[PDB]
Design a protein around this ligand. Sequence first.
Ligand code: ANP
Ligand code: MG
Length: 280
Amino acid sequence: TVFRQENVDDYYDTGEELGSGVFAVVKKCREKSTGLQYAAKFIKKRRTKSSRRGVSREDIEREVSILKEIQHPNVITLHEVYENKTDVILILELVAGGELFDFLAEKESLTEEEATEFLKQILNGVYYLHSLQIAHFDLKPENIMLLDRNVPKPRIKIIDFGLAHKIDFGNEFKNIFGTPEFVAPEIVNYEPLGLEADMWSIGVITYILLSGASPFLGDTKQETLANVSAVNYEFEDEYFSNTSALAKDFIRRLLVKDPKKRMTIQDSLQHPWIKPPQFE
Ligand SMILES: Nc1ncnc2c1ncn2[C@@H]1O[C@H](COP(=O)(O)OP(=O)(O)NP(=O)(O)O)[C@@H](O)[C@H]1O
Ligand SMILES: [Mg+2]
C-alpha cells in the first residue's frame, strides 16, 4: 500500500526524541492544523531487495496494517502514515510518561497492588489484541509506556507493533525472534508460534514487576536462551519472601514450556490473583 508522500514537515513540527531502535527513531511532534501532539516513528526503508539495512516493505506494511485495526485504551493507536524515499513515518498516539522500563528503574520496589495495577491493564490490552488474533511478539517493559508517570497508579499503553502478526491458522511459522530475556521456548527453538508466546512474556514481566529481577537472564544471550528453553528459573527467597503464594501460582502457570498447557489470556483474567537481536 502507498502512503502520503507530502513532506511531513509541511504538516508537523518535530521536537524531543522519544526513543529509538535499530532501524527506527521516534520524535515528539505537533500537528500544525490542530496543535495536537503525537509520536512520529521514522522507520528506515531497505535500499535494495537483498539488503540487511532497513526494514522490508512487507514488514513495514504489516506493522501499519495491524496498527490500523486497533482501538483500545491500553494500546497505541495510529493517526496517519507518510513516506519518502528513505523513511516510512508513522504518526502514532503519543504516550508521554516514559517506558515502564524506566519507571521500574527509577522507582523503589513495587507492592503487589502496584504490580497488579500495571498487570491488569497489560492483560486488558493483550485480551483485546488476542481477541483480534493479533500476537504482539515483543512484550517487555520497554514496549509498555505510561500516560503520566506522576500519578499513584499510572495508566499504560502497549506500543511497538514491529513484530506483531495476525494468527489466522492458530500458529505462524516465519521465525520471529525478539529479546532473549522475554522470548518463549518455542521462539528459542524456532517452532511454530501463536498467541501463547505473549502469555509467556507476560509471565516474565510479572516476575520482574514483583521482584525487580529477571527469571532467565544469564551473562550472555546464549545463556539466557538456554535457560529459557530449559525453563531454568526459580523464585529466590531473597526477592519473593513477602510475595503471596497466589502471585507465584499465576507466574508458574505462564512459565510453562508446552504452549498448549500455558494459561491463555482468558485464563489469566479469571485467575484468582486477578479476578475481582538474539545473537551476540
Ligand atoms: N507512541 C509512542 N509514544 C512515546 N514513545 C514511543 C512511542 N512509540 C515508540 N516510542 C519510543 O520509541 C522507542 C522505539 O520505538 P519502537 O516502536 O519500540 O520501535 P522498535 O525499534 O521496533 N523497538 P526497540 O528496537 O525495542 O526499541 C520505544 O521503546 C519508546 O521508548
Ligand atoms: Mg521497541
